[PDB]
Design a protein around this ligand. Structure first.
Ligand code: NAG
Ligand code: NAG
Lengths: 57, 50, 7
């Protein structure tokens, strides 16, 4: 939604451009546009969903 | 100077003008081909007359 | 959210 995608060893994070601040790649940290097949340099990953930790109760 | 992939720099320069980053990657080859062709036209314009 | 309300 803002900033950039980043990778660790094998974790991935999102951060703002101008100061490193690694956060989990959640749906509320991200947004969707189209299927993958168009995109140059995309990577397979898990996007975390915060709703299911709530609705499981 | 911090290194950044050029296609990601373009995505921010799009973001800066109020076009959302996805619109670049959804069109990357077309954008590159326009840009490359346009630089050809620049060279031709400067070749044609002083 | 309402479509997910099967829980
Ligand atoms: C994530 O980052 C920390 C610091 O680089 C490191 O200790 C940890 O092992 C990394 N984990 C993965 C799976 O990348
Ligand atoms: C992503 O993972 C799926 C797993 O079935 C695989 O079919 C696909 O080719 C992978 N794509 C990339 C870019 O690795």
């Amino acid at each position: 939604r803002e900033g950039v995608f980043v990778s660790n060893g094998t974790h991935w994070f999102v951060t703002q451009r101008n100061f490193y601040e690694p956060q989990i790649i959640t749906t509320d940290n991200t947004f969707v546009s189209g299927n993958c097949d168009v995109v140059i340099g995309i990577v397979n990953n898990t996007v975390y969903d915060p709703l299911q930790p709530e609705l499981d109760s | 100077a911090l290194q950044i992939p050029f296609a990601m720099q373009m995505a921010y320069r799009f973001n800066g003008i109020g076009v959302t980053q996805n619109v670049l990657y959804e069109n990357q080859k077309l954008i590159a081909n326009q840009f490359n062709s346009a630089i050809g036209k620049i060279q031709d314009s400067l070749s044609s007359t002083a």
